[PDB]
Amino acid sequence: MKFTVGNGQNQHKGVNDGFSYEIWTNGGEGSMTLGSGATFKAEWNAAVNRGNFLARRGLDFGSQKKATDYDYIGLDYAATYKQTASASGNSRLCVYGWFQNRGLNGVPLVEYYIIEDWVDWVPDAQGKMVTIDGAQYKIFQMDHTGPTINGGSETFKQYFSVRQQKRTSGHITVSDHFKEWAKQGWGIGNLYEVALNAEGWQSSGVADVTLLDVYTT
Secondary structure: OEEEOOOOOOOEEEOOOOOEEEEEEOOHHHHEEEEOOEEEEEEEOOOOOOEEEEEEEEEEEEOOOOOOOOOEEEEEEEEEEEEEEEEEEEEEEEEEEEEOOOOHHHHHHEEEEEEEEOOOOOOOOOEEEEEEEOOOEEEEEEEEEEEEEOOEEEEEEEEEEEEOOOOOOEEEEEEHHHHHHHHHOOOOOOOOEEEEEEEEEEEEEEEEEEEEEEOOO
16 A cells, blocks of 8 residues: 655555554655555655655554653664665654643653664754663754644754664664653653654655554553
């Protein structure tokens, strides 16, 4: 089952087997092919000025409770991921989601990234190295202004963990990243979703996610 963007429709989002799916582009083309469960394969050609593409699948949490209230959140994945063109472009493979702050006081709206692999460029800022799942990640936060899960342009926060040693398979203790961000004093809203995300800016490539499991205990 395939969903194509950049040829009439710029987005498709839905659910299958209890896991979300979403593909979107501005100015590129691409497709996502679902597999069982949360698995999928995606391909994009957006190696054009301001070409932008995303494909992601994940577990919705309903924005019900503080992300760090969940005792354990695991994500296990295996993928092949390749960038094949770059017009001064880049891409990343990452865990992705939001902390919703609707109804919450003195808490920011957060889009978060746990970046496992990237090509040519990755976000960076003054940050701190931490050890999670036996591996080094740099954590930092930054302002961003743009469209949001809530509607049009606003100024919100992005939280990042960037894996120092790139990889395309393994176990992520997603709840340990949330704890590390919490330890910095950063505000933590209600968990919207936990997804695995392939995105590309002014690039082309493929991500074939053959294993993807997201769970909470």
